[PDB]
Amino acid sequence: SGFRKMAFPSGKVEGCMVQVTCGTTTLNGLWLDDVVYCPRHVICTSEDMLNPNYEDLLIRKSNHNFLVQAGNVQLRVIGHSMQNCVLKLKVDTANPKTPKYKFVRIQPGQTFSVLACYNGSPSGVYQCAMRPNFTIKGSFLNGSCGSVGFNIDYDCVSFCYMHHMELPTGVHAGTDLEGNFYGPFVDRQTAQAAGTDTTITVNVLAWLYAAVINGDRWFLNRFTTTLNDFNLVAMKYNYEPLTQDHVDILGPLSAQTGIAVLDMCASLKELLQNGMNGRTILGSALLEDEFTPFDVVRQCSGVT
Amino acid sequence: SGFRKMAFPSGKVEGCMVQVTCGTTTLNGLWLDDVVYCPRHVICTSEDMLNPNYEDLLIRKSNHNFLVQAGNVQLRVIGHSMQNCVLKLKVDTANPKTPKYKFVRIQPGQTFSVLACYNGSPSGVYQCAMRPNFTIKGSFLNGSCGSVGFNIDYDCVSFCYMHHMELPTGVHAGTDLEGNFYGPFVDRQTAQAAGTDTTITVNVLAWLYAAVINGDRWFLNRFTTTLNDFNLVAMKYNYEPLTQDHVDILGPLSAQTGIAVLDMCASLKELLQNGMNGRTILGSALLEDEFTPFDVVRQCSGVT
Numbered sequence A, B: 001s002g003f004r005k006m007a008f009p010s011g012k013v014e015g016c017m018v019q020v021t022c023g024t025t026t027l028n029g030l031w032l033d034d035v036v037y038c039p040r041h042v043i044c045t046s047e048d049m050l051n052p053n054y055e056d057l058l059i060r061k062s063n064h065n066f067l068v069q070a071g072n073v074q075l076r077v078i079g080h081s082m083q084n085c086v087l088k089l090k091v092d093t094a095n096p097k098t099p100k101y102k103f104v105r106i107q108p109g110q111t112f113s114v115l116a117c118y119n120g121s122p123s124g125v126y127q128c129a130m131r132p133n134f135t136i137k138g139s140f141l142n143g144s145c146g147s148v149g150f151n152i153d154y155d156c157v158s159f160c161y162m163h164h165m166e167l168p169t170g171v172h173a174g175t176d177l178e179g180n181f182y183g184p185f186v187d188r189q190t191a192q193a194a195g196t197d198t199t200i201t202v203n204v205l206a207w208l209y210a211a212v213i214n215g216d217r218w219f220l221n222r223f224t225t226t227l228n229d230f231n232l233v234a235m236k237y238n239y240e241p242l243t244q245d246h247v248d249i250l251g252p253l254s255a256q257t258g259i260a261v262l263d264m265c266a267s268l269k270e271l272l273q274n275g276m277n278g279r280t281i282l283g284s285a286l287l288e289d290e291f292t293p294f295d296v297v298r299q300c301s302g303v304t
């Protein structure tokens, strides 16, 4: 028992982290096979970050201008190319520590682990969610760019995120491993609107089931609701509308606890309307939304 | 910016995890050099867990009865011995992935990362604190025994915890790597009192400084307090008394923010007496105590 914001073991990703320096800028890169991936803003100086012409900036750069270091060994750069907002530096040596991997574009509301890095060295690992507004509420300092987000399925690492920037609001933005930003963000030092975020309803319900599994049942009530009635409440509280797909995904948890999804929705409705009254659920005084139904099943079943 | 419950990168520890089976019981072991460490209850069956005579149970076991598997290779056991509540299985092969390591006995209120494992395979990593009452509020299922807690300082892994049991109350108990339990716990299936836990005051204050560093300042007030006055409030709210050693440890954070430790104590006093009024601090609706002053400095400075 117990329920924690658990990250995937980071070893397979630690073996891929490298340092990429171009001119005066140093950030993190991801070495997979004979390619190093990193944010394209590694080629910028602070002067041109206001409105960079990446194509023109990259033209002034040659293979020998990209210094890639893996631990204490230097990698030889034999090719460079820009794909969207990422640079792909072809190196002459395949990473011997390359795990089985995939590049995936995750959906908002899904979760992943982040290995925060500085100068190509890992500092920590934490679990987070891609917000419905495509931002992440991470923990990153200057130099963390190029740190990646990932999920692990047995021996396969699915890389889903590469860190690029911190908005003036303190939230984080980045891309998939093809360099496409999640959300409307651009890699320029300009004010950028993140847009209204919502609470991931399906994750809150998954977490309520995790609470029941781990003994926290004070919030269960004698009521039920309908999808339509619940969604009117979700609207008022900036919760994403619950759909039959979400109910279906919660099927396994509903079966394990014997609590119908709409009965759990009525518990959630009462919590939204009345608050927690000073009580906690799984050590939290707010409704947690950064655990998917899959995360709950994984943590409560012990998938390695 | 941003503040997360960040764990150490788990790679160096993943390389040490093995599966230990004795008879019908399988748990995790830690392979360092030519020794595998694991909880001594691996030699028990469910029948004798009520009141085990470990000395007598271990006598019926020989080296060949301990099956140690590292991934898919079997390790050859050439020696066994019991040290307190841990078994040390001498194997004929030194772990090639053994990191630079130390065994340390951490103090209550200190933090560490846990690599939860099942059948010798890592499933997740999370950060937690040793509670003042010597329990940990982890996330563990049956089979997680032998999973370890650790801290990393540059290239050195300081192992501080090995998981042994879950109390009927759902909290976790275990030992240092010499097999000495933290707290009054015994490795028997009997009801065991954990004792009154307190909130780690120095960690709450460290986290209040982390909030100020990251922009959350709504809780700062026009008041100050004394150690004696604050401690009367800490007493009422089951907070551990704050000492000059704790004030001293908060020195770096007080210097970075320019907020005197006793002024931060007055903010904490007002939060204890008046609650949060429905507001949050660093995404939390309660006062967080599982970040030490060292953790705050590390996360806010980017130590790799």
Ligand SMILES: O=C(Cc1cccc(Cl)c1)Nc1cnc2ccccn12
Residues within 6 Å of the ligand: A041, A049, A140, A141, A142, A143, A144, A145, A164, A165, A166, A167, A186, A187, A188, A189, A190, B001
């Ligand atoms: O924000 C930037 C630089 C930058 C500016 C404008 C656009 C782009 Cl793509 C990059 N780096 C960064 C990443 N994460 C953090 C956390 C804190 C401070 C800085 N961080």
Ligand SMILES: O=C(Cc1cccc(Cl)c1)Nc1cnc2ccccn12
Residues within 6 Å of the ligand: A001, B041, B049, B140, B141, B142, B143, B144, B145, B164, B165, B166, B167, B186, B187, B188, B189, B190
């Ligand atoms: O509690 C035990 C077995 C046991 C019983 C009595 C004493 C001792 Cl030392 C061990 N194993 C265990 C560890 N963590 C968990 C989580 C859940 C269920 C079981 N867990």
